[PDB]
Amino acid sequence: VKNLKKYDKNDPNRRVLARDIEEANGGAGVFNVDLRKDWILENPEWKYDKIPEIF
Amino acid sequence: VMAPGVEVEISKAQKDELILSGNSLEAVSQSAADIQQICKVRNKDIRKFLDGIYVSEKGNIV
Amino acid sequence: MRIENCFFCGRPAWPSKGITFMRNDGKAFRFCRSKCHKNFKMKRNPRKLKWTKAYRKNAGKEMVVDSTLQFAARRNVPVRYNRELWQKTLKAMERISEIRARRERVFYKKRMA
Amino acid sequence: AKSARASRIKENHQRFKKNIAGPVEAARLERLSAKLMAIAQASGVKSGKSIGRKDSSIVFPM
Amino acid sequence: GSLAFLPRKRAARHRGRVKSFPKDDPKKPVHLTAAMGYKAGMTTIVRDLDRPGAKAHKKEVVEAVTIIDCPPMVVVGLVGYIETPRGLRSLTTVWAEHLSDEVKRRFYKNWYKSKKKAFTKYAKKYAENNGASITRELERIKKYCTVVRVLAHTQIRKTPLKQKKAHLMEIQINGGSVADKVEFGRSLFEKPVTIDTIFEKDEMIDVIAVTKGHGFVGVTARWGTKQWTVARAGQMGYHHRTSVNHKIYRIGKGDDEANASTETDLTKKKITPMGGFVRYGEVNNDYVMIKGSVPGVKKRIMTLRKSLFTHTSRKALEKVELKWIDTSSEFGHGAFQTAAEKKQFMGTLKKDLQTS
Amino acid sequence: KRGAPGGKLKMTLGLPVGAIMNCADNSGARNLYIIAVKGAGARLNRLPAGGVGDMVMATVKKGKPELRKKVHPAVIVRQAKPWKRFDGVFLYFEDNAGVIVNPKGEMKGSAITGPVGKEAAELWPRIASNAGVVM
Amino acid sequence: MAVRAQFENSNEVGVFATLTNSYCLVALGASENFYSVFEAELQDVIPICRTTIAGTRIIGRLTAGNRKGLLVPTTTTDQELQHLRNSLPDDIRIQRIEERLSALGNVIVCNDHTALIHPDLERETEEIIADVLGVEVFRQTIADHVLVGSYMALSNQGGLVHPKTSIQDQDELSSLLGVPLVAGSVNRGSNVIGGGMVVNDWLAVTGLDTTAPELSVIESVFRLGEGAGPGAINTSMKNTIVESFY
RNA sequence: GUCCCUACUGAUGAACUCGUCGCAAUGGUAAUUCAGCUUAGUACGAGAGGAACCGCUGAUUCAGAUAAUUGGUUUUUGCGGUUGUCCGACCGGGCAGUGCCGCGAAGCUACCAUCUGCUGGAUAAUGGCUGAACGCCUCUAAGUCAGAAUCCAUGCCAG
Ligand SMILES: [Zn+2]
């Protein structure tokens, strides 16, 4: 936190930010969020896998 | 969409200005009118909101 | 998703099937059929009605002490996703199901001895 | 509320048709027609090349 | 009621007709417009919804879906129409050779006592060097027609129905020159065409059917009350309807043996409910699984056709991730997906000991 | 601003106009008498009705005399008539119950006795904050 | 630092957010404005999880936890639980509790050393909280309001309490906790502090209707921003508080 | 203190050999309002306050269907309990115009349940382009551009 840089909307090389990501990839009612993008598993390829629920 | 035979350019002589030239005066003028009509304010104040595309000069290329 | 169990009779309660009763004390009452709901509303004892798992367990019509039933229970502590873990779990579920079938066959044989 | 037959609503529908559904349905049709093609390819008078005659009224009988 | 569904009359035909195919342009690839199927029933599912902007976004929702038994249809003909100042006119039709007994039953009304003599001379026209005349008919279609349709019939003897008479209809070919469409149909002669070949998953379609009859019913139910504008008593039900925008959620292959299995439910089970569809039976063929309610009773003939207009909604551009399909009994309050699950839940029984 | 909630999905309405319900907060009111609902569409001979999460107008039939003085707005919290939630779950409560709220959506009381409807908690943040059991 | 934000158009950020010293939970809905302000304030220092519990957006009033653990009601589904587990590092322990008062964010306030609970919680829930959160659990009613999670917000630097709390009770709570406490309001006169504000040791998010005097009180008591200091309220800002909230 | 013809609404139908697949003259014609999200605490504003176009998601009414689920309905007189009387008693049953009660499939229903409701052209008020009448000027006289939930049609029902 003390090693961070304060966010400002005018700096050229600012942080990307999810607002900018959704504005680039559609809008507020069109962007589809990937809920598994931040999944921290053991093997990174196990993301986007259909976990069985009923057998 | 301009009529066939009318060329429109962003000319670098003055700022925020657009040149619309051609051979058919009717087509040129109608294209200018179409742009001016497409950019018109609604439900605002005419005396306070003063933005749009307007015909500034009329004449000949040569 | 999840497979629920009927509060009254214990049959598998699948999505859409049944009515859920929310009592004012804060506990939820999930039923699998209108039969179960109406029995609960007329306040009969599932421990007395003979077509219920409560009655059958009370009267010892089913096996209740076995590792094949200790292996499955509700989990309140999540485990991090692991493909080997889920696949091996599925195979273990198959093994457990057939072992349970054989044990229940033996139990009902012993009851009908 | 804008009517379902409003001109602005029709124009918005036209844009949506032309910029999303167009490409999506084009790809879908390409795949489907590929499958159709897979299943499908799974003297003039005396030969039929010259299309001749097989075997109330508009005019008054004379 | 609505003055748009009047003269409130019984449907003139049981099959139900398309009445409009989507407009055709040569730039698209060659394809067929419509298909046929038989209503088997309807069931319950759970879909992981991805509707950005909805409160059920990234949530599981329970939906009702209608199941249509769709055995592959057989192409047996090709019809060519011309444009005239009075409309479209069927210039000529050329059939296939070796027609089936079911389509010949369609042609006949008392099939049992009849000498089954339909299209025999036409087959002789193929075989006895009148193929010149047949090619002449094909070339007439090539050089004079503007729209081409293909004659196709269903397979009752695969559908679990007491009926034996099939159903013919013309499916319009779109996307190409008339020559390309003629070659396509001629090559499609004597070949089965599948529903996964005509449609596919995620696609909204239009369903043409005859909604169920209820006989002479008064105004209270006929219109919904407390000159043609005044509510009158008469026939209510058995009405031709074209219902639009129904999402195709799944196409099951019939021979898959795991039609009802999803990537979430690892149960090797098929679409047919435990005990069979009530009043219908089992679905052993290709089946179409579509959202919502659809006109028609069980085992009724149904027409499935492509949308007339390119879609304007995000519900038509969405993927459908299925979680599970209900296979419990429709004959009562069923709670078991499979007989194996029922046996495992209830244990072994007295008749089990007596038989074993 | 009319107290019509936004984004609410369809549910079966269980409390019509002229309906007596319990009061779930410690505001001192015991029962409420729904006389009007917000967002209703006037069609001939139909009595308007409201479901869990709808704002209504009610007169306190019994309770605190300060509250038995004016027509108060109220968000209805519990519904005895069964309704379906989009997860396919049909459910109902033991009684019909609501809480006194201002037109902005803020409660006069400080606590809610009994459980709260999930739709009401989602629709009104203050009820979600003053609720103890949410199902 | 103290920032003002709105979830969708609502000033109650505590209903839709849960901020701790090792993770942040954000309600999922429509746009990414709320997640984005939280991310711009926490640029990947700690994970942020877009989560739903029981198909609701009230995750802030439904979940309680600190940097050592997270507790969710029994109504939480296995999918949501697994989402939380995959999103959060293994150094945080997540559990579902079978409490009748399923409004966990309303019945529990917890800093990283102590927790204060609704007096009618079950004993088993008490040991579960004391074990998972790793805190000393005390039962108390704040300003005679039995929902501590709704009527008080706590951090390891301080704690802001219902505006109508007695001085004796405030002193007793301060002694029992170990941090400074101040009686203040959020969102221009709102008493629901927990529902209108989320705070950790270095970040607070309030509603957009939070006035300047009360935002300065928040920054001061929670030591957010330069010097801060709970004492400055009693020295530098008295005139402001007396003139504004007379 | 004076059951008939016809209109309308549906249903059959002779002759054109029976049948299958079609076309479409003409007639009918359908959707409606609100809200929420983003735009945006933005434009605008001293302050207090505070929009809109595109894009997205729901709800009211209306219309047409449908029954997976969930209620209701029971002559399934299907099963069980129970009152009075009777068949000598048990068992098994009759009678009480369906004795009474509980559950109850199937069918039927229900904005008490669920699904679906679609696009081109030409216009009015009006705003324009070129340009006479009238050596200025002028949207009009010749010519022409846009534009309303309007008009005519497609989609839809009948044939
Ligand atoms: Zn049950």
- CB atoms under 10 Å from CB of A47, counted, come to 15
Taking alpha carbons only, the member of G149, G45, E306 closest to residue A3 is: G45
The span from the CA of G13 to the CA of G204, in Å, is: 10
Q: Which chains reach chain D with 3 or more Cβ–Cβ distances below 8 angstroms? A: E
E79's enclosing H/E stretch is: strand E73-84
CA E271 to chain centre: 17
Tell me if chain A has a CB within 8 Å of the CB of C34.
Answer: no
Quick one: closest CA in G to E59, which residue? G55
- CB atoms under 10 Å from CB of C74, counted, come to 9
The span from the CA of D3 to the CA of D60, in Å, is: 53
Residue whose entry in the numeric block shows the structure tokens 């692991």: C82
Nucleotide nearest to G6 (CA to C1'): H41
Tell me if chain F has a CB within 8 Å of the CB of C15.
Answer: yes
| Interatomic separation, CA of residue C41 and C1' of nucleotide H94, rounded (Å) | 36
Residues of F in contact with G153 (CB under 8 A): none
Taking alpha carbons only, the member of E51, G50, G7 closest to residue A30 is: E51
Tell me if chain E has a CB within 8 Å of the CB of C33.
Answer: yes
| Interatomic separation, CA of residue E334 and C1' of nucleotide H104, rounded (Å) | 14
Measured over the CA atoms of residue E139, residue E145, residue E147 and residue E150, the dihedral's sign is negative
3-state secondary structure of G4: strand
Strands G24-27 and G48-51: parallel
D9's enclosing H/E stretch is: helix D7-16
- CB atoms under 10 Å from CB of E302, counted, come to 26
Which two three-digit tokens encode residue E31? Answer: 């394809």
3-state secondary structure of E353: helix
Cβ separation C26–G84 shorter than 8 A: no
Q: How far apart are the first and last CA of chain C?
A: 41
Q: Are G159 and G180 in contact (CB under 8 A)?
A: yes
Nearest-CA residue relative to C1' of H58: F7
What are the distances in angstroms from CA E309 to CA D19, E208, E241, E326? 14, 16, 18, 33
3-state secondary structure of D36: helix
Q: Are F33 and F20 in contact (CB under 8 A)?
A: yes
- CB atoms under 10 Å from CB of E85, counted, come to 4
Taking alpha carbons only, the member of G173, G193, G184 closest to residue G216 is: G184
Experimental method: cryo-EM
Cβ separation D40–E134 shorter than 8 A: no
Q: Are E148 and E178 in contact (CB under 8 A)?
A: yes
Nearest-CA residue relative to C1' of H10: E234
HSE (side-chain half, CA atoms, 13 Å) at E53: 9
The span from the CA of C11 to the CA of C65, in Å, is: 20
**Distance between E356 CA and the closest CA of chain C, angstroms:** 12
The span from the CA of E172 to the CA of E313, in Å, is: 26
The span from the CA of E175 to the CA of E25, in Å, is: 5
Length of chain D equals: 62
Cβ neighbors of E52 (< 8 A, separation 6 or more) are A26, A29, A30, A31, A32, A33, E314, G30
Cβ separation E328–C100 shorter than 8 A: no
Nearest-CA residue relative to C1' of H120: D10
DSSP single-letter state for residue G190: B
Which two three-digit tokens encode residue C69? Answer: 């039933």
Q: Are E172 and E33 in contact (CB under 8 A)?
A: yes
Cβ neighbors of A22 (< 8 A, separation 6 or more) are A28, A31, A33, G31, G32
- Calculate the CA dihedral of residues F87, F90, F91, F92 and round it to 10 degrees: 140
The span from the CA of G88 to the CA of G81, in Å, is: 11
The span from the CA of E182 to the CA of E78, in Å, is: 8
Amino acid at G245: F
Strands C19-22 and F89-93: parallel
Alpha helices in E61-147, H assignment, sequence order:
101-107, 120-127, 131-144
Q: How far apart are the first and last CA of chain G?
A: 27
Measured over the CA atoms of residue E55, residue E60, residue E66 and residue E72, the dihedral's sign is positive
- Calculate the CA dihedral of residues E267, E268, E269, E275 and round it to 10 degrees: -90
Measured over the CA atoms of residue F10, residue F14, residue F18 and residue F19, the dihedral's sign is negative
Residues of G in contact with E60 (CB under 8 A): 79
Cβ separation G75–F110 shorter than 8 A: no
| Interatomic separation, CA of residue B12 and C1' of nucleotide H139, rounded (Å) | 34
Taking alpha carbons only, the member of G104, G97, G26, G91 closest to residue G65 is: G104
HSE (side-chain half, CA atoms, 13 Å) at G245: 18
Nucleotide nearest to E83 (CA to C1'): H23
Q: Are B9 and B18 in contact (CB under 8 A)?
A: yes
Burial C1-27, CB ≥16 within 10 A → b, else e: beebebbbbbbbbbbbbbbbbbebebe
Nucleotide nearest to B36 (CA to C1'): H128
Measured over the CA atoms of residue G100, residue G101, residue G105 and residue G108, the dihedral's sign is negative
The span from the CA of E44 to the CA of E66, in Å, is: 9
Tell me if chain C has a CB within 8 Å of the CB of F82.
Answer: yes
CA–centroid distance, B3 to ligand 1, in Å, is: 74
What are the distances in angstroms from CA G171 to CA F33, F67, G222? 44, 35, 17
- CB atoms under 10 Å from CB of E136, counted, come to 23
Which two three-digit tokens encode residue F119? Answer: 């739709």
The span from the CA of D42 to the CA of F85, in Å, is: 50
Amino acid at E5: F
DSSP single-letter state for residue A44: G
Taking alpha carbons only, the member of G67, G65, G66 closest to residue G53 is: G65
Which two three-digit tokens encode residue F106? Answer: 């803020």
- CB atoms under 10 Å from CB of C55, counted, come to 17
Burial of A43 (0-12, 13-18, 19+ CB in 10 A): exposed
